[PDB]
Amino acid sequence: SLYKVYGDYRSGNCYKIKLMLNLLGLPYEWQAVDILGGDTQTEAFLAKNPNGKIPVLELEDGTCLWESNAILNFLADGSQFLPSEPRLRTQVLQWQFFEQYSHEPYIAVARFIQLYEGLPEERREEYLKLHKRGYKALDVMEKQLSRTPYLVGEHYSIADIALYAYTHVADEGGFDLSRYPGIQAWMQRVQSHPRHVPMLD
Ligand SMILES: N[C@@H](CCC(=O)N[C@@H](CS)C(=O)NCC(=O)O)C(=O)O
């Protein structure tokens, strides 16, 4: 009612918003969008996000906010999930831009190729390159989480939420997280939050 999400629960970018809404106890309606079925290419959808992607968060007055990581900032602002100190707020945004530039296009797309398309031969060379670049991003996270328990110091924030969404299913794109015990112990910490919800119910 206060919030309406247009989304697909299987999409890591949309899972970020399901998780944030539940962690904050905020009420929502979920409108399932079928991207293969054409739902993001209609004019009705493009009026909500001209970039043609989910998730979209629609507010009570009809205003539509898009980009999953910008939606996390809107929901979290003033909460314990988004620091107000400029250096710490900047570090949270650093991990979020890093997630959109250096991580998502390798982790999410490898998972699409393998889980959604069954790893076709025609995409195998592409897939192996995504593996090399995705592992490079997991290596960055492993070094940080070998030193602090969340990406930004001692406090769970929307940087962790942004990176947990696809990292927790990186095995579905053929990444072997047993190589990353610091990532695995962080996934455990995220998942231990008393209001945590899984991607699928
Ligand atoms: N940078 C966007 C990416 C969102 C995105 O790539 N959504 C995919 C599903 S995970 C999508 O809507 N694809 C539809 C299309 O491109 O036609 C965000 O983080 O919200």
Ligand code: NA
């Ligand atoms: Na985003």
